[PDB]
Amino acid sequence: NYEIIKLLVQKRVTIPRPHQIRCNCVECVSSSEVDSLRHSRSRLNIYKALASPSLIALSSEDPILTAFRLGWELKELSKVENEFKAEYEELSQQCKLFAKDLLDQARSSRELEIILNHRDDDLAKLKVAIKYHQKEFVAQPN
Q: Where does this chain bind a second copy (CB under 8 A)?
A: 2-3, 6, 9-10, 13-17, 21-22, 24, 29, 35-38, 40-41, 50, 53-55, 57-64, 80-84, 101-103, 105-112, 114-115, 123, 126-127, 130, 135-136, 138-139, 141-142
- Decide: residue 79, CB within 10 A, 0-12 exposed, 13-18 middle, 19+ buried: exposed
Minimal distance, residue 139 CB to a second copy, in Å: 4
Q: How far apart are the C-alpha atoms of 138 and 68, rounded to whole Å? A: 12
Contact of 116 with 123, CB cutoff 8 Å: yes
Q: Kind and range of the H or E element at 54? A: helix 53-57
Chain center to CA of 48:
9
Cβ proximity to Zn ion: between 18 and 53 the closer is 18
Residue 102 binding Zn ion, by CB under 5 A:
no
**Does 19 carry a binding-site annotation?**
yes
Residue 23 binding Zn ion, by CB under 5 A:
yes
DSSP letters spanning 88-131: HHHHHHHHHHHHHHHHTT--SHHHHHHHHT------HHHHHHHH
Contact partner, 2, from a second copy, Zn ion, none, Cβ < 5-8 Å per class: a second copy
Contact partner, 28, from a second copy, Zn ion, none, Cβ < 5-8 Å per class: Zn ion
Q: Which residues does the annotation place in the binding site for Zn(2+)?
A: 19, 23, 25, 28
